[PDB]
């Protein structure tokens, strides 16, 4: 597992045949494992695209990893989904797991469908980012945040109050699922593509 | 010296950390008087100086292949450590080689007279 050293204005991979002291690891607090938002790669934010990026697979048990914090996410997700028989789907978050601190648009889903798999898994292998613990699995309830962890060697209420767009699901674990925004106890807006959370927010001009 | 990710990188990292150096008052320190849990966080925004942000995205991208393979091999549930181990291996790779002056280690100072 390579780390990037910050030196001479560039990142440098740690696997070199000399640990040159041009940079000094004077303490353990120069170590970093900061998360990065998957969205910062130009990755689509469509609610269906998020589903398109999730594996929905039964599998080897989930793991999380401690990591250094990170960039704000514009979009993140919450899940209440259950199997059509009302069975719980996807494990509930374990104690000490909580949603990412700075997503500006946490999205939420509820309703039922087949909800295939048990540990879902990210299709890119991207970590779910729950606070300081990255995850291989989607946890129920709490905000997921998509991202990856970088390891590098170092040489106000709105910050969390922003968040929009909660919706029902028709079916689950497939990209055939319908997502419907809920407003004023009405279920409408399929969210199929190209709608920013603000594009969706302005739709309340009809309420 | 590594290449920037080929995804369109977002040039700014508005970011947050749990770090908050110091304790202006001891009450900030006392759990009884502690901040709301979100208050521990602090924030600012990175700018892509020297091209580092997109390189960072690639660093994460590449590094995650090794990372998750490792995580699959781990037996700990929450894998709370790693960097600490890396610090250990930093030192292990700094030590046990022969090293007086001639060897490429120990940051040896030029000889005095």
């Amino acid at each position, epitope marked *: 597992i390579p780390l990037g050293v910050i030196h001479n204005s560039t990142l440098q991979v740690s696997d070199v045949d000399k640990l040159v002291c041009r940079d000094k690891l004077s303490s353990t607090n120069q170590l970093r494992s900061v998360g990065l938002n998957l969205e*910062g790669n*130009g990755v689509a934010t469509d609610v269906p695209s998020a589903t398109k990026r999730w594996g929905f697979r039964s599998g080897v048990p989930p793991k999380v990893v401690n990591y250094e914090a990170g960039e704000w996410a514009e979009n993140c997700y919450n899940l209440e989904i259950k199997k059509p028989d009302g069975s719980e789907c996807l494990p509930a978050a374990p104690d000490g797991i909580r949603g990412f601190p700075r997503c500006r648009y946490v999205h939420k889903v509820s309703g039922t469908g087949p909800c295939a798999g048990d540990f879902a898994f990210h299709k890119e292998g991207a970590f779910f980012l729950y606070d300081r613990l990255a995850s291989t699995v989607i946890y129920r309830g709490t905000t997921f945040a998509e991202g990856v962890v970088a390891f590098l060697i170092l040489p106000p209420s709105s910050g969390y109050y922003s968040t929009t767009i909660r919706y029902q699901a028709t079916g689950f674990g497939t990209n055939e699922t319908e997502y419907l925004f809920e407003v004023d106890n009405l279920t409408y807006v399929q969210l199929e593509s190209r709608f920013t959370p*603000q594009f969706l927010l302005q739709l309340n001009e009809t309420i | 010296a590594i290449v920037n990710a080929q995804p*369109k*990188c*977002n*040039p*700014n990292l*508005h970011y947050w950390t749990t770090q908050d150096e110091g304790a202006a008052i001891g009450l900030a320190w006392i759990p009884y008087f502690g901040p709301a849990a979100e208050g521990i966080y602090t924030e*600012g*925004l990175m*700018h*892509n100086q020297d*091209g580092l*942000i*997109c390189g960072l995205r690639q660093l994460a991208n590449e590094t995650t292949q090794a990372l998750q393979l490792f995580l699959r091999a781990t037996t700990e549930l929450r894998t709370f450590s790693i960097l600490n181990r890396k610090a250990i291996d930093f030192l292990l790779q700094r030590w046990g080689g022969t090293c007086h002056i001639l060897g490429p280690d120990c940051c040896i100072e030029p000889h005095d007279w």
Partner: nanobody, 118 residues
């Protein structure tokens, strides 16, 4: 879609200072940390500076003399640059266009405003 807005071109007496203004066509500006660039007398662009759109922090091109006053008014989706000690040789097209590091974001200013002196 991102567009930037400015008042029409103007002529000023020498030693003038000018508070250049730029307004976003939408909310996307909040993460933009907008850049200013210049074409003196139709010259290839010179980077001028930038203003963080969330915190208002700024940077500048040290080659741009007298720098510029740089301010932000996030509530107005607007930001400003101030010209200083102007002379007729300083006439330029002044851009609040944003030169993104990457294609992931972008903004530009088509208003065509030029400040001139006489």
């Amino acid at each position: 879609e991102v567009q930037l807005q400015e008042s029409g071109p103007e002529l000023e007496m020498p030693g003038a200072s000018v508070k250049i203004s730029c307004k976003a066509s939408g909310s996307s500006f909040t993460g933009f940390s907008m850049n200013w660039v210049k074409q003196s007398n139709g010259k290839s662009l010179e980077w001028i500076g930038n203003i963080d759109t969330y915190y208002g922090g700024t940077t500048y091109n040290q080659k741009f003399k007298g720098k510029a006053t740089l301010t932000v008014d996030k509530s107005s989706s607007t930001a400003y640059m101030q010209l200083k000690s102007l002379t007729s040789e300083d006439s330029a097209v002044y851009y609040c266009a944003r030169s993104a590091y990457y294609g992931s974001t972008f903004a530009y200013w088509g208003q065509g405003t030029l400040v001139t002196v006489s």
